[PDB]
């Protein structure tokens, strides 16, 4: 574009070809600079621009179908079921051994409608049964309150998430690393800036391991894309609006500009062409031609286009359990009346013993082995987040 | 201000950023600009001032003096700058009251109708 | 009717030229009217029915009108109160102003008239079922 | 600022004080225009600007009648109503087609209602197929009521205003503002 | 939340005792 | 609102400070209506 070498004092660009007589006009994105208008003329700016921020278009999270289980860990949901069995089984045992309406068929039913806080009809009339029901009544009071409170904590923290809308937002929030091309007007903007925000941003960028500076614009656009939220690229306003309209439609331009530049049309400082060109640009500005051409090349040739309430995507598996719960209940009324329309202890003899034989065995073969706990471990790199394991491990109750 | 969020005023962006920093803090600037213009320092046509003035404006722009003066007069001398949860009022939950009385109104009808027409 | 703010005793009794709180309580107006209409028709049926107990049928459909009066008196108060709070929201929020609504004894007598005409309706279903008994 | 009369062709303002000789320089918010730089000399712009939109700041909205429904989307409330009919029909088909009766179509609506508003029972379905209709809708209710309370708590904690319009493309499409 | 599990099993443990004791000593 | 006594080493600290925090604090205090500056220490303790 044009820069006077400090040694040889020689311009080397389109500014060079105007100073050294090779050309008559430079109609190009040439920034109106002090050191350039000392050697050439400029028209009034045909395009105003500045330094802007490029971030990735944020993301949305996809609720994997059983996402409604997420406020409690899967170890909790497992031990809720093991405690649902345990409270049902202890009900039926206490109820048989009492002066009954209860079966284990009913004791599965007391313990569920107490988990769902939906009331029950069968009351454990024994005061030994009242200890069973009462502790499962308090159990599910603490489990339901913990589900609602951890889900409220999720939805509050997700609503407190504020995207970057300024350079002050990048200034404060240091979780996103922001950078610049390693050689140009954008890097030299922050290096000499005596504005408090941009002085702080330069302090971050010069002192950052690994390097936030990229070497090419196409390198800096790529680093925005393969960082998923963590890189912001400081570039010029017009390339930011142009890459926003490319494929993939992945990045976006946030904020206003951080400074004010202009692009001018340059003539060789003596020309008879310089004055009619200056009045051409002001005529094309006020006849809307310069905004018409920007729409044509940024937006009309664009490869892209141009609620706070909870959605069914989130609570979707609670309907799939509901349909699957109705679908299984059509099966039962089928087979149970087919048991009734066709309507002993040796099967009770066989099953109770043969369950124990595996039952003694399955705990036995598990406690003697060493595959209770897998344990991966290691360090990551930002190299596609690819992981090496520097500690694989197994565990048993004693045999590790 | 006196239209309850039903009048949007199209004006220049530098006044729009200035009125936003006044008292009250009622107004707000939205979007980006619609056209692009500039304010320049004017001299008579053919004048000794013209070329040193033009090189002065470019030097103040790149040293950051013109950005420093705008933060000063628009924002540092700006009146606007830059909680404590309140009780739920009845206007927020007035719907379940209308569904309650509307549920009692549709319940007295089904009582008075069907017991007569048993 | 105003007071100490410019001290004027200008009971505007608004029908024409003028704040918007006074226009929103205009919107809630028909519900204490219909409630007062169903109180009056519940009693001018009640007063004649002390003279004529002769079939049984009187104090039931007056007791319907005692209960239907209070239910439209609820909707009267809910629309009245919510219309205040809608306009207390939209005023302006400075740290140098203070708005203070307060409900008076005229509001309270309307709310006391709820419990009386509802409990009147409860006894009105009582002695209807005593004359249907006798 | 300076304009030219159609008849007298005389420049007013700060422009005419430069065209005619009263002044030597005009440091001002003076717009670089075509018709003005034909008669004076501007510098490069010291301030860039344009036409913008001014709106009143968004405050807390007014609550409608059905404002209490807003923690869940309308797509959910419909699918709850469809599922409430759905679990009462299936509870009826459990009861009518070969039961264990007392659970009519009007009773199966009444069991699933107090189930979803979490209000006891009247009688347990006493089948097994009635229980699975009863038991799964009880877990459905628990997740939906907990998601209502948890999403309303997020709303009441974090006040988050939005503007109606965000550009001049938006103003052109609407007719409300 | 491991406490309400220990109170659950500890509540079932103290409930089987009161069952096995008192029905024998009726 | 935070303030300083109107004449002393504390006010002249912020006035000449070129540290980014204290430069911002001086910008607030010089441009503040009503005046955050007190005239006496016992006045400034009372205003707290
Ligand atoms: C007889 C044994 C039953 C065990 C039930 C435990 C529930 C969870 C199972 C845990 C096993 C540990 C295995 C470790 C891997 C986790 C698997 C899991 O977490 O399993 C959930 C399954 C679907 O597996 P997923 O990995 O794709 O989902 C998780 C979503 N991801 C993929 C993003 C993480 O979800 C499902 O549908 C299946 C379970 C549906 C929800 C059950 C919780 C309680 C339900 C009703 C209450 C009980 C009545 C009253 C008391
Ligand atoms: C006293 C005792 C009472 C106790 C009562 C409780 C027991 C009641 C029974 C409960 C179980 C019901 C069924 C739940 C089992 C799993 C449901 C399921 O897995 O259903 C999801 C399906 C498939 O979705 P996906 O997982 O393959 O998604 C892609 C997965 N990804 C993203 C990982 C690649 O979705 C669909 O269309 C299926 C929708 C229609 C199926 C019917
Ligand atoms: C079994 C059900 C048991 C009891 C329910 C009985 C009926 C419920 C009581 C009547 C409700 C009613 O009468 O509500 C009248 C509303 C008022 O209109 P609005 O402009 O203030 O709406 C506010 C939205 N905002 C301000 C943003 C424009 O009008 C509307 O329902 C607009 C029509 C929307 C469709 C709803 C159908 C009727 C309403 C409830 C059922
Ligand atoms: C038995 C008697 C009724 C129970 C007590 C409620 C008071 C009755 C209202 C009334 O008549 O005297 C109270 C005031 C008259 O003094 P003030 O207007 O200068 O209030 C200035 C506030 N102070 C009084 C602090 C200076 O009136 C008011 O403010 C009304 C505000 C308080 C009343 C709440 C509105 C209706 C509530 C319940 C009515 C239905 C249930 C029946 C019981
Ligand atoms: C009617 C109720 C029905 C059923 C409940 C029956 C009993 C409950 C089950 C026994 C609980 C138990 O067995 O808990 C043993 C604990 C373990 O001690 P820790 O040092 O890990 O405490 C943890 C605190 N940390 C880590 C900060 C030092 O010991 C202790 O209860 C320390 C003694 C504190 C006084 C509690 C009395 C006994 C416990 C529950 C009743
Ligand atoms: C049997 C019942 C449901 C009859 C219906 C009348 C009442 C209950 C209804 C329920 C919802 C209410 C509405 C709610 C508020 C709106 C906006 C307000 O600016 C004027 C009244 C208006 C337009 C409605 C009028 C009255 C209305 C109070
Ligand atoms: C009938 C029941 C209650 C008998 C009690 C035995 C079990 C259930 C109890 C309940 C609370 C538990 C405790 C909980 C965990 C602590 C700390 C841990 O570092 C060692 C075990 C220790 C100190 C306890 C031992 C075992 C203990 C598991
Ligand atoms: N949102 C939501 C939601 C609604 C109902 C039930 C569960 C959730 C939910 C909860 C959680 C969660 C996680 C940790 C702690 C607490 N809650 C997460 N998610 C969720 C949302 C999007 C993608 C994946 C999970 C969820 O969808
Ligand atoms: N506030 C409130 C409130 C009180 C009870 C029930 C519901 C609400 C409510 C909830 C929500 C909402 C929205 C999204 C996510 C979660 N909650 C919104 N609103 C509301 C408030 C003002 C105007 C319109 C709706 C509400 O009024
Ligand atoms: O007059 C100048 N005009 C410039 C115009 C542009 C572009 F945006 F493409 F129009 C760019 N790029 C910015 C990033 O993407 C690739 C090139 C550089 C310019 N530079 C050099 P810099 O500003 O020193 O980096 C000038 O000197
Ligand atoms: O050169 C010009 N410069 C201008 C500069 C400004 C200001 F913003 F104050 F700097 C304004 N205002 C816009 C908002 O209301 C107050 C006055 C008008 C200007 N006008 C006249 P307009 O643009 O035709 O209306 C010019 O001609």
mmCIF file of C-alpha atoms in Angstrom, chain C residues 7-84:
data_model
loop_
_atom_site.group_PDB
_atom_site.id
_atom_site.type_symbol
_atom_site.label_atom_id
_atom_site.label_comp_id
_atom_site.label_asym_id
_atom_site.label_seq_id
_atom_site.Cartn_x
_atom_site.Cartn_y
_atom_site.Cartn_z
ATOM 1 C CA UNK C 7 -53.439 23.228 46.933
ATOM 2 C CA UNK C 8 -56.335 23.369 44.453
ATOM 3 C CA UNK C 9 -59.638 21.793 45.441
ATOM 4 C CA UNK C 10 -60.375 20.944 41.819
ATOM 5 C CA UNK C 11 -62.607 17.901 41.870
ATOM 6 C CA UNK C 12 -62.244 17.252 38.146
ATOM 7 C CA UNK C 13 -64.701 14.258 38.170
ATOM 8 C CA UNK C 14 -63.200 13.536 34.765
ATOM 9 C CA UNK C 15 -65.307 13.257 31.614
ATOM 10 C CA UNK C 16 -63.202 15.556 29.381
ATOM 11 C CA UNK C 17 -59.952 17.544 29.003
ATOM 12 C CA UNK C 18 -56.965 16.900 31.302
ATOM 13 C CA UNK C 19 -53.127 11.148 35.543
ATOM 14 C CA UNK C 20 -53.477 8.005 33.433
ATOM 15 C CA UNK C 21 -53.963 6.143 36.713
ATOM 16 C CA UNK C 22 -57.274 8.019 36.727
ATOM 17 C CA UNK C 23 -57.967 6.641 33.244
ATOM 18 C CA UNK C 24 -57.176 3.039 34.191
ATOM 19 C CA UNK C 25 -59.571 3.051 37.137
ATOM 20 C CA UNK C 26 -62.120 4.133 34.526
ATOM 21 C CA UNK C 27 -61.413 0.775 32.861
ATOM 22 C CA UNK C 28 -62.146 -1.165 36.053
ATOM 23 C CA UNK C 29 -65.424 0.758 36.778
ATOM 24 C CA UNK C 30 -68.141 -1.755 35.558
ATOM 25 C CA UNK C 31 -67.229 -4.434 38.074
ATOM 26 C CA UNK C 32 -68.184 -2.665 41.341
ATOM 27 C CA UNK C 33 -71.290 -1.487 39.471
ATOM 28 C CA UNK C 34 -72.409 -5.026 38.540
ATOM 29 C CA UNK C 35 -71.537 -6.105 42.080
ATOM 30 C CA UNK C 36 -73.688 -3.319 43.551
ATOM 31 C CA UNK C 37 -76.427 -4.232 41.076
ATOM 32 C CA UNK C 38 -76.356 -7.858 42.212
ATOM 33 C CA UNK C 39 -76.353 -6.812 45.870
ATOM 34 C CA UNK C 40 -79.452 -4.649 45.377
ATOM 35 C CA UNK C 41 -81.344 -7.247 43.328
ATOM 36 C CA UNK C 42 -80.291 -9.850 45.877
ATOM 37 C CA UNK C 43 -81.951 -7.843 48.640
ATOM 38 C CA UNK C 44 -85.084 -6.529 46.909
ATOM 39 C CA UNK C 45 -85.688 -10.181 46.183
ATOM 40 C CA UNK C 46 -84.756 -10.917 49.823
ATOM 41 C CA UNK C 47 -87.069 -8.289 51.321
ATOM 42 C CA UNK C 48 -90.148 -9.515 49.447
ATOM 43 C CA UNK C 49 -89.265 -13.100 50.319
ATOM 44 C CA UNK C 50 -89.667 -12.429 54.010
ATOM 45 C CA UNK C 51 -93.262 -11.584 53.030
ATOM 46 C CA UNK C 52 -93.641 -14.568 50.699
ATOM 47 C CA UNK C 53 -91.866 -17.752 51.890
ATOM 48 C CA UNK C 54 -94.622 -19.763 50.298
ATOM 49 C CA UNK C 55 -93.039 -22.149 47.774
ATOM 50 C CA UNK C 56 -89.366 -22.225 48.774
ATOM 51 C CA UNK C 57 -87.685 -20.928 45.692
ATOM 52 C CA UNK C 58 -86.788 -17.337 46.657
ATOM 53 C CA UNK C 59 -83.633 -17.228 48.776
ATOM 54 C CA UNK C 60 -81.693 -19.602 46.517
ATOM 55 C CA UNK C 61 -81.543 -17.363 43.442
ATOM 56 C CA UNK C 62 -81.001 -14.351 45.676
ATOM 57 C CA UNK C 63 -78.168 -16.275 47.324
ATOM 58 C CA UNK C 64 -76.855 -16.900 43.819
ATOM 59 C CA UNK C 65 -76.910 -13.130 43.407
ATOM 60 C CA UNK C 66 -75.102 -12.581 46.711
ATOM 61 C CA UNK C 67 -72.293 -14.912 45.624
ATOM 62 C CA UNK C 68 -72.166 -13.674 42.015
ATOM 63 C CA UNK C 69 -71.892 -10.156 43.435
ATOM 64 C CA UNK C 70 -68.783 -10.908 45.468
ATOM 65 C CA UNK C 71 -67.066 -12.808 42.669
ATOM 66 C CA UNK C 72 -67.413 -9.801 40.395
ATOM 67 C CA UNK C 73 -66.243 -7.730 43.352
ATOM 68 C CA UNK C 74 -63.003 -9.746 43.399
ATOM 69 C CA UNK C 75 -62.450 -9.017 39.696
ATOM 70 C CA UNK C 76 -63.245 -5.408 40.510
ATOM 71 C CA UNK C 77 -60.488 -5.227 43.089
ATOM 72 C CA UNK C 78 -57.946 -7.219 41.053
ATOM 73 C CA UNK C 79 -58.444 -4.994 37.994
ATOM 74 C CA UNK C 80 -58.308 -1.925 40.222
ATOM 75 C CA UNK C 81 -55.083 -2.884 41.969
ATOM 76 C CA UNK C 82 -53.260 -4.195 38.890
ATOM 77 C CA UNK C 83 -54.114 -0.978 37.035
ATOM 78 C CA UNK C 84 -52.320 0.965 39.770
#
